[PDB]
Symmetry: C3
Subunit: 149 residues, 3 copies
């Protein structure tokens, strides 16, 4: 069985006057993530992990963060891989992410064609350290495992 690992990282600044969208869930908050796309740090980190596992390069090579994640899953499937699972962490000082985690997992699972039991998202703060601990930005990390057919 030809198993492959991938890992992803993303970070965006948080700014006034942008919606906060993470894992495709819009979360009520006075600030949101700055980027070219909707800046969805969590979907971007998972997309990178998936391309990384498939050795299809990265998000910048290929490319709604949902649309991108769905095109990523297509390209990975087309390259002959199946997705075993995704795990991820979002690091944000605020707001509270816990009540939105199930929604992110549902969006991710739909977009990757997986059952919910193969998708995990975890939330952390940065314990008031650094730009994350001060609310100036939000980070996501992801890991994915593929099997090549």
């Amino acid at each position: 069985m030809d198993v492959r690992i991938g890992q992803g990282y993303d970070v965006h600044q948080l700014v006034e006057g942008r919606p906060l969208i993470i894992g495709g869930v819009t979360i009520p908050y006075e600030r949101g993530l700055l980027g070219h796309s909707d800046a969805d740090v969590l979907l971007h980190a998972i997309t990178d992990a998936l391309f990384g596992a498939a050795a299809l390069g990265d998000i910048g090579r290929h490319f709604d963060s949902r649309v991108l994640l769905r095109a990523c899953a297509e390209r990975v499937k087309a390259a002959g891989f199946t997705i075993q699972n995704v795990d991820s962490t979002v690091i944000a000082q605020a707001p509270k992410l816990a009540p939105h985690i199930d929604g992110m997992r549902a969006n991710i699972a739909a977009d990757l064609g997986l059952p919910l039991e193969r998708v995990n998202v975890k939330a952390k703060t940065n314990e008031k350290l650094g730009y994350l601990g001060r609310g100036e930005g939000i980070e996501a990390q992801a890991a994915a495992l593929l099997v090549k057919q």
Copy 2:
């Protein structure tokens, strides 16, 4: 073989009047890690990597005790009960001081004991942050972990 990956991250601030406990090892040092638990940054990241691979959420979603070895063992029991077995764990601790390398063996032996795994399936690595950022100024300590499971 139904293999699954998990990854974990944790960071705590260094403060006076706390012991420094990492990988269950008490490390002599003028400061220790701040949290509501014993703030064992390494055991927390590994615990999160293990729940993450089993798709059982995270430490937050779970476990009220301060002793992070008790939490790591309960983690292992939940993982086992969910039908998985652990292939291995690897991890990194980042601290500008003290030097962590002489303390790594003891963390390996604590984690191995708590997960019921032989030493050869348990790895801990030590890094500094090259005097960059809050880590590089000695203001806290970060750990990263990865774990692989097989659902049986």
Copy 3:
């Protein structure tokens, strides 16, 4: 099948007067990474992911960062020695994935050169080696161009 995961992290400061070598690629730039060896952050993070998946400790356990032998060391030589220890311990490498994070210079145009070196060093085909490039969106020391971070993941199977 006895599969094992490894992960790696490294970060170095950018300073005047050093070459910039990442993934074994010399990149033209006014600053380079500072460390004991040539400070190749990406090879170091992959080297740590490889030792970590094989439970062989870490780069500092094998190549001391205060031993004169490794002052200015070409980090490809350490990567190749790491891969030989990992194979000798009974493992084959399934694949490596990695990310380099720098606000500057642009790293995306150099990814394919880094993959080529790493694949050659690990005795792997290109389709088992991946390197991704990111910026830090002007956040923190990485966002202000003060250093460059690398992250890696390696998957082994024990024979």
